[PDB]
Amino acid sequence: MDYKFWYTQPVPKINDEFNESVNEPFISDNKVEDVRKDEYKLPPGYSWYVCDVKDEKDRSEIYTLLTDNYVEDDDNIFRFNYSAEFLLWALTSPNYLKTWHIGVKYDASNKLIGFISAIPTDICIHKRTIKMAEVNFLCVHKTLRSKRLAPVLIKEITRRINLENIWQAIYTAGVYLPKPVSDARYYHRSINVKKLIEIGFSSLNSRLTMSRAIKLYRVEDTLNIKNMRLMKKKDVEGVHKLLGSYLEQFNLYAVFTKEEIAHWFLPIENVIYTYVNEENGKIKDMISFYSLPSQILGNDKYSTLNAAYSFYNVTTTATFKQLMQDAILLAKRNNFDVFNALEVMQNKSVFEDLKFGEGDGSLKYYLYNWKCASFAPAHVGIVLL
Ligand SMILES: CCCCCCCCCCCCCC(=O)CSCCNC(=O)CCNC(=O)[C@H](O)C(C)(C)COP(=O)(O)OP(=O)(O)OC[C@H]1O[C@@H](n2cnc3c(N)ncnc32)[C@H](O)[C@@H]1OP(=O)(O)O
Ligand SMILES: Cc1c(C(=O)NCc2cccc3ccccc23)oc2cccc(OC3CCNCC3)c12
Ligand SMILES: [Cl-]
Ligand SMILES: [Mg+2]
């Protein structure tokens, strides 16, 4: 790995190590006036396209590109299948820029073959809050891989973000790149045991027969926190206080405004689920998970694995274990087959007791143009989609 593209960028070399006394840009005093006003050049026959995710047909284009070409597991058994509705949610948060939703079309067919996106958010890293872009959904058509199109998309979005006087970004990826600020393994909790076996997600042994596996993962249909209920607009102030106060302990987290709390947490069916426990007009506990199904490649019986992904969870009237037990139950009540989580915040503390299994790799967290100490993933307090 020579990282010929990445070593041109303001990111740590593979062997850079910085102390906690270092928490600053690689390149400071940047000037918006000096940013290139020209679009990056694409190979002949391809063109930039600005996607309007609020237009159903453009959003469908992006949906099709990612359905066919996005992230797969290591066995190329499953492929993420973010819904069109979910995309609309993920990309139109407060003060989003349409111009940071960038496609690349093949001119001869008029088809989208590449995409990259960002949204703006304030990010607190080691107690310093910085306006950043949160980058996601980088995708190149499977037919056009290893042609160095991804550096083009990354340089063009970096240009458009710099035009807004933003000079840092946050992103995650399963591949190792220079250089993670933190690295968090994923774990899963089986809900529909038998389906997870049948599609090859989970396995059995002579010691764990099918019926024993179903008994091992069986959950009581009663909440530990009885009044946990879907979040409503009235709860926005309360969730802003409860989650805001909790997040301040972490080395890395988004600093949400009230408008951001309403966007990111008010529930949308098949997209985002937030439940709250109100006691005396105060929000005292919250659970939230989002829907990210995967397409099950070449399966006769099942086309989709319906997966809930843990988002932000806070308790002050129960244990974390009790709260996360209730999160699994609420995911089961909404028809999910499995509950997935990263070893961030307090999550790893409940994985053993709650019957989570360890997955097959890790999600690396990264900053662009930021020099700082790295840290264990329990100190991460942000989850990207
Ligand atoms: C101030 C603002 C700053 C804004 C921007 C911040 C930075 C945002 C950065 C993006 C954050 C995205 C976050 C995100 O979306 C979440 S991670 C999910 C990324 N998407 C997928 O994995 C979908 C399936 N794969 C693909 O579509 C292609 O394999 C992709 C497009 C990933 C790469 O296409 P390709 O046809 O396989 O490859 P080439 O075009 O020939 O390019 C090779 C170069 O790409 C470097 N590469 C490979 N994968 C990367 C990845 N996941 N991040 C960053 N860099 C990655 C690679 O190391 C090499 O550089 P190097 O030669 O130095 O080693
Ligand atoms: C990327 C990821 C993985 C992950 O890659 N797990 C392997 C895996 C198993 C089964 C089906 C799969 C389908 C597509 C890709 C991977 C699959 O596991 C997570 C568990 C929690 C959060 C995650 O990453 C978030 C959500 C997805 N986009 C980037 C940030 C991840
Ligand atoms: Cl260049
Ligand atoms: Mg390429």
PDB file of C-alpha atoms in Angstrom, residues 34-41 48 155-156 159-160 163:
ATOM      1  CA  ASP A  34      -8.004  30.830  -3.428  1.00  0.00           C
ATOM      2  CA  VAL A  35     -10.195  27.762  -3.955  1.00  0.00           C
ATOM      3  CA  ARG A  36     -10.254  26.472  -7.595  1.00  0.00           C
ATOM      4  CA  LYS A  37     -13.454  27.573  -9.304  1.00  0.00           C
ATOM      5  CA  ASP A  38     -13.141  25.013 -12.059  1.00  0.00           C
ATOM      6  CA  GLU A  39     -14.651  21.533 -11.815  1.00  0.00           C
ATOM      7  CA  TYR A  40     -12.244  18.677 -11.703  1.00  0.00           C
ATOM      8  CA  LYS A  41     -11.663  17.032 -15.045  1.00  0.00           C
ATOM      9  CA  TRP A  48     -20.648  15.949 -13.437  1.00  0.00           C
ATOM     10  CA  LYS A 155     -11.087  16.144  -4.877  1.00  0.00           C
ATOM     11  CA  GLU A 156     -14.259  17.639  -6.455  1.00  0.00           C
ATOM     12  CA  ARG A 159     -13.376  21.780  -3.639  1.00  0.00           C
ATOM     13  CA  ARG A 160     -17.111  22.415  -3.142  1.00  0.00           C
ATOM     14  CA  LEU A 163     -16.030  27.023  -1.267  1.00  0.00           C
TER      15      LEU A 163
END
